[PDB]
Amino acid sequence: PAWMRTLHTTASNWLHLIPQTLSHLKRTVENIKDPLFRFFEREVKMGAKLLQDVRQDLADVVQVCEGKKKQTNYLRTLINELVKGILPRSWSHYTVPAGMTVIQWVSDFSERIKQLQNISLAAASGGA
Amino acid sequence: TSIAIGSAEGFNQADKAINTAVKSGRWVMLKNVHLAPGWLMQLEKKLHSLQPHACFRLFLTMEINPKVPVNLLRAGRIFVFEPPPGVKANMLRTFSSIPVSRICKSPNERARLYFLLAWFHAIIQERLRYAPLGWSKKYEFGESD
Amino acid sequence: MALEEFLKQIREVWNTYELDLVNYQNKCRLIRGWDDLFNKVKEHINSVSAMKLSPYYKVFEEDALSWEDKLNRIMALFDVWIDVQRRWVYLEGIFTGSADIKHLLPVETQRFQSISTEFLALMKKVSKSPLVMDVLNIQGVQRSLERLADLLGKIQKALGEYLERERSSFPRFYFVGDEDLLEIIGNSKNVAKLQKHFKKMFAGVSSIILNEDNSVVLGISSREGEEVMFKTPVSITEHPKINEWLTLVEKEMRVTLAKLLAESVTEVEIFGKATSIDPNTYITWIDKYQAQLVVLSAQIAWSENVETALSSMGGGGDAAPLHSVLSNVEVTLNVLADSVLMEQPPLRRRKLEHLITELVHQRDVTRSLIKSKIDNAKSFEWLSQMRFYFDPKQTDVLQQLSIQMANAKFNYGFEYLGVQDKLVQTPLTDRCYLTMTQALEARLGGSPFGPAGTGKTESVKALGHQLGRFVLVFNCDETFDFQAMGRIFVGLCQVGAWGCFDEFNRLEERMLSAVSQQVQCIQEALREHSNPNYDKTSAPITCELLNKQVKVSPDMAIFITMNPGYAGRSNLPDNLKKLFRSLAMTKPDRQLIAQVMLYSQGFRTAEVLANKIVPFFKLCDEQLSSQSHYDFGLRALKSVLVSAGNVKRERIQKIKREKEERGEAVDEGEIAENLPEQEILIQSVCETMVPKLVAEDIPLLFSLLSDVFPGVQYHRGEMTALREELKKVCQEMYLTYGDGEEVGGMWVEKVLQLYQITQINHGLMMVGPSGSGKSMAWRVLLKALERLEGVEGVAHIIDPKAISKDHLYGTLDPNTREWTDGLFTHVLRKIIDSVRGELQKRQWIVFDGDVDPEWVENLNSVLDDNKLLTLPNGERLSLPPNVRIMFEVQDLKYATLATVSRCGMVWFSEDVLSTDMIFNNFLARLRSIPLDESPMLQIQRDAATIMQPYFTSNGLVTKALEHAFQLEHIMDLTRLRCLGSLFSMLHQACRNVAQYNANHPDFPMQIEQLERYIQRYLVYAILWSLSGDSRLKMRAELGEYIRRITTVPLPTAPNIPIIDYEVSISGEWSPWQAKVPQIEVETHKVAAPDVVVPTLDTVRHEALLYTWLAEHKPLVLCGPPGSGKTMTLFSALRALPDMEVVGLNFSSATTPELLLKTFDHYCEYRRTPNGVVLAPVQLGKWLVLFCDEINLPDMDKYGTQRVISFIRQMVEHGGFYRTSDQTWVKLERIQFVGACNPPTDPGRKPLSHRFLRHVPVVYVDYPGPASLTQIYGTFNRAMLRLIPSLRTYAEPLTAAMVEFYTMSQERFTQDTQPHYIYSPREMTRWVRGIFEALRPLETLPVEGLIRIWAHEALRLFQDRLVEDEERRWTDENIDTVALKHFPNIDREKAMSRPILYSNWLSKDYIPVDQEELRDYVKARLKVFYEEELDVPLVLFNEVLDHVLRIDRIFRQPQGHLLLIGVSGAGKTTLSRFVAWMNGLSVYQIKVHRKYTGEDFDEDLRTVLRRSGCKNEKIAFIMDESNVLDSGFLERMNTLLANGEVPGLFEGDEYATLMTQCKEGAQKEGLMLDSHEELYKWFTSQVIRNLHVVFTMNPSSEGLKDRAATSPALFNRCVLNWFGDWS
């Protein structure tokens, strides 16, 4: 179908823009006492989980649109939202302005992950 | 006779009030009729086959709701009530709603206070049009306030 | 002979114990001593039960069993007698003390007289022989009481209108339930029974003080013991009737308080504007007067001082005496602060806390007045304050006190409030007071709105208590309708009480509009009081409520509190909103509340503590991780602050307790000097916040604690006494107990944490994933507290989502307005009534199930400080202190903040329950509990030793479990589903060894053989328990992983998976292929429904099903539709006799009521001494409920399937609640088997993890190409023995069948159309169809065989296709497949495209020419016009094919049709025409605008009687338009699949059906007399005679949705896509 081909390009393109790695902050006896580490650890922990979920969902959609895995109920719900351009409710994990569409969320989500990577990189290389 | 619609007893009371009013010229107002879209269709059919008293009037109060039947809308005359278009229209509506004897009581300074209240009420309500800048939220500053 | 002594003692006790009799008003001799009777009977019942365990019980077994029967009969009699005597007492009082009721209800009065006669006659017999045994032997005494109880209940329910008349005479009765009101009215002479009801009619009156006679009411008392002595006592003798002296008591309460206020104001004025206050005099004045008057007196004195000071400052430049007003407050507050620094009586200490809170506000207001340089009493900054003016010269004592705020003026109601905890008077609370009092002056309602936990409800009550008003809180829901709200208003208006309706937006929008009329008319009446022209000596103000003229007291008010941010709530109509003044309460002033509360409790560093605790809660909300069970709001802060005062008091008591045994240096002042106040606060935080934390947040919060409270350490009390009892309870329950880091230590900490929450909260939640030890944590704690404290613990476990919300809380009758209790309401009311001493026991109500806002928000007033269950009938049930409300849940993803903030949280993680602990529990039970009902235990014990090495941590099972979670499973994988399956299989292995010993009585299995068997069976059990729900590739992969890590010997085959091997009883691996013979099937059983061709999968699945079924373990078969789940289950049941299967077909609309109808037909409810037991009617049989679509039932918006919760309850709790009588029913000999499609399929929902832990899942896939060749190659060989000349073509015929079926299954899928499901069911129909066309044939050429093969392929694969391209592909590939497998055949004679078969032109079903068929149909249509329907039809080619297709289905048993096409295409007409050709009667339901569900049920009964009893072949033709309700198809879904509807025939209909079935079976020559036998024959007749034709238009959305509503339409009906005319 026409939608099946168009959605395949969009999902593959989104996997290019969205980053792929997010390393959790290493908890340390003196890092727990640091308030900045405590807040920043939450950001990556909730950020890493959201990053993996979106990438896995997008990869399944690409594989579905290549006719390699069968469409499940979750994929049917996700694919319907992506065709209509509505941001999936599963992806919605941080507060966003009302009326934000899926194309803006992917670009917004990609920027947030980059900042999350830099924060973890500083903690990994240099310390908290 | 004013009747709220939601109750089952309200439906029975509405029919009796309407039946009595169409023979005496009495006025009947039914409020929140958008809460009973199914009963509204039956009321439209009831009104069609009826030749009431020349002074009889039926008022239906509803929110602007897509649930209201089209057939009822065509049978009646629609009046939209909404925020006044601007500051001038807001203040003219206020001065018409308040009786003249109310403003013109013994203290002569009462008139200027009502004007200040009317101006203040117009400015506050008109800022709602600027959803975010006028007020952070869409407060329901209204006639009760 | 110790047993003989017990029998002698039991015999001697009951040979002398007499019913203790008391005369009752010279009418009879009632029975007291119910506690003595019941405990004595229970004690002997336990002793008789306990002595059975003794080995010497055999000699005295008969005598003990005789006493067990007698003691049980004593219990069953006097448990009814007590309720009968109680009800007769107050009914006799009503039907004697009110002669008006005889005229009002003559029938009831005469009926009560007859019952009152039989009661008194039975009383006189008891008087003659008060011995219990003599009473127990009275003829029919058990049945006499049973009739008396039922008859007295009918009289009780018939007095409702009489009770509504009495409620007017004392309007506080409007807030009392009907039964309690009858107790009040009927016991008007027995005043002691009235005490428990005063808390319902009064704000703070818990009891009344009476003289020795009980004839004069001396005063009133509160629940805390505070007493008010009336100045003029009320005599009951001079005013005998209940409603007049109750009115006089209510008046004297107001008059005495006003008189007491005047005396208090006189004394407190000396303290005001005084330089120095002596503490002894001030404490004396506090102790002399009531708590409400003490604070009121302080407010009056302060107000008059400010008025006096401001009056002197009239000149402006005059000196300010306001500083003296501040000075007096400073001095008085210092004395109050000093008093609370030392020990005080509990009542005085609370009074001091109230005064400190009041004066801190007065200090703040006076400071604000001084800072703002206010010098005039008419300044608004003083007028905006709440002021208190007292006029001693006023003649009426009730009007001496005036409370004024801005322009609003109020009288004090002088309602006795007792000792109500006061709020800290914060700026938000000040703003709340100003706004609400403005609404009260405007005669408008107050509408505080905001998020949860902001003080909305408490502020309304605080304002009401400030004004001395009776404030009633109602927890509103959707059941608060127009009639319920109006009746509540009637009570509020006449009493003069305030109505605070919380969660007011939970009403329906239509009800909110209707209620606005009642609110408006009351408000107009309220303005009539405010009219100066109106005079008090005139007609009372009255408004019309519920079409009645109701007097309105000026003191009444209406308040609504709502959270406008909650989604799903009802929007208030504007006409209702204009009746209320709204105030936003969003940000409570937490630091001020904390500072004042800690300062009032006696903390010297309250300012330091408040500046730390409030930011600490803010930090926790942000620094800690985000969890749904996390709350750090004002309720959490309030809980810690209140707990801080309790912890401070216990330490002070502990410090001096150490001082008693160490010297005599009690120096309380110095004791408070060296008191670790910060450490006290940390203990309260940790006792309340820590149990809710996940593991990774625990170190975070302690780092935060060290950040805000440096150098302060938390140390739990080492609770040796409780831990010792817990350790013993764990041993008796086969549980693992640990201490610290030992095995089970984490779980024991959670048990101790749960105990701490029980002591601080009356409502708490245990939250954690399924299998976290939550249930065992509170079940063990309940038993441990019984042993530790001596208090019996009782748990009522409720599944709230297994029943409707109507059945949980109750319903108000729409017409009679009668209230029926729900499950929770009945349980709580039983505890409050305390007929059998429920108030002396620990009562835990555990809601084990899903939490959603729809039902739990009815408990908002229960879980908060109100502790009240409010019902729409106006009744309010107080939570007794011995009751805990508990919620055991797996998640809180749908609970709102309102619920989470009101409950103590104990979080369980899956790490709390370690896998080692579960292994220990299974092994401990295996070594102690015999499986037979010891040679069986000896086998288990030896087997336990063999299994022990593999069940250690990091053992074989642990490593296998970890690897299994990495694999893909058809359902979500949980640890306990695997282990539950694994332990069931190992129990079967122990039974196998015992069964072997039965077969070999000479040589029982030795340890070497026993060891050799168990290790291989364990490996076998591990594979099926961990991969039986996965595909073959995943089952294989777990095999190699086990092969690497195990040391158990394994099969040495090179490429054969381990899952392909069983374990023989000789401890040898044996291939499963040895049990798969190549059978030859009898030629008449070809593709019959009961015939199973043995394959590798069938023998393995049957053996696995046998193990689970033989253990009565619930199980689910999952697989694609048609994969053999029903076939495998029924095949396994044949090898398992003594088990009856009953098939239930779930739909999207399936509710638990479908299960209940099955119980009504196959099972009986019987009363046993231990409760109601539900068991199958047939004895010695285990009844199996087979649910075919267990995962179709609709999931609500909160992720719950009601029937699934109901099944989980019956499996895990072994029963359910009977909603008619709110009685627990225990299941016996009932097991459950589920079948379903994979949850990823459309319409299918994932099963709850709490249900899956009990239910092992086996995955049944479609047979592969080789398995299909083996199955239907066997069938084809048998069916081709009819024609010996066609034997050679068996293999090519099977190969063509498999090839085309596989191609069609790939070509057409559910993605294209929802009904494109191809399964081996089509293969079975394919072979059957050819076989039916070959039986009457003596010979046939091979080309004739291909034509039948091609014809059946078109009927099975092409008739459901929607598109012409799809039908073209099927037509072409039938030719391609046939010639590929059948060369050297004449294509034209075998594959001529018009393939038509009919038995209309001959005796046999042989091919028919199209033109010959057309002439025959025209000839028959001519007759059809003249006999049935004179509607001429034009005959085209598609009609001829269609009528042949319909004719085929009408000639098959259970032949159901799903005709899909455009309206007006002839679907109904052709069906009737073919039905007339086959002798089938046509039945169509005669719908109309008023056709309802019970009309459809009666129509269903008519068709079933004709086809089931009269042997009448019926074509039941029904269109989609005939479906006027979804309930129509729930009946048809059962009828299509099972040929029966379990609940259709009930009562007289079933009795008439049995008479007709007996007559019908007699005409057939069958010998049937049993009702069960008759019903089975009736079902078999419906199966063979009733044909259902369903016609519907093609709708893509409708067709897909149709599958869930009626799955039988797509798997039990043959679908023919007629579509539109081409």
Ligand SMILES: Nc1ncnc2c1ncn2[C@@H]1O[C@H](COP(=O)(O)OP(=O)(O)OP(=O)(O)O)[C@@H](O)[C@H]1O
């Ligand atoms: N302390 C313990 N020691 C040993 N075994 C235990 C212990 N606690 C629980 N178990 C066992 O482990 C399992 C835990 O079941 P339990 O009912 O305690 O869990 P739950 O979290 O309440 O379950 P659900 O989420 O299904 O309501 C059961 O098989 C139980 O017998």
Ligand SMILES: Nc1ncnc2c1ncn2[C@@H]1O[C@H](COP(=O)(O)OP(=O)(O)O)[C@@H](O)[C@H]1O
């Ligand atoms: N001013 C106050 N002083 C003391 N406690 C308060 C105050 N305001 C609120 N609380 C407490 O906060 C909690 C929530 O109050 P509640 O009235 O139930 O809030 P809401 O109605 O907004 O949900 C209760 O423990 C209540 O006693």
Ligand SMILES: Nc1ncnc2c1ncn2[C@@H]1O[C@H](COP(=O)(O)OP(=O)(O)O)[C@@H](O)[C@H]1O
């Ligand atoms: N080994 C077998 N022997 C006989 N019939 C089989 C075998 N395997 C599959 N079938 C056929 O597969 C179909 C399975 O039907 P059923 O058990 O109702 O499926 P499910 O329960 O999966 O919906 C039947 O037509 C049955 O005859």
Ligand SMILES: Nc1ncnc2c1ncn2[C@@H]1O[C@H](COP(=O)(O)OP(=O)(O)O)[C@@H](O)[C@H]1O
């Ligand atoms: N083959 C036909 N030839 C002539 N008229 C027909 C034919 N099929 C249907 N009709 C007409 O259409 C009417 C509706 O037929 P019916 O069986 O009720 O249709 P459906 O079941 O498809 O809605 C018939 O009463 C008849 O007038």
Ligand SMILES: [Mg+2]
């Ligand atoms: Mg509240």
Ligand SMILES: [Mg+2]
């Ligand atoms: Mg549990």
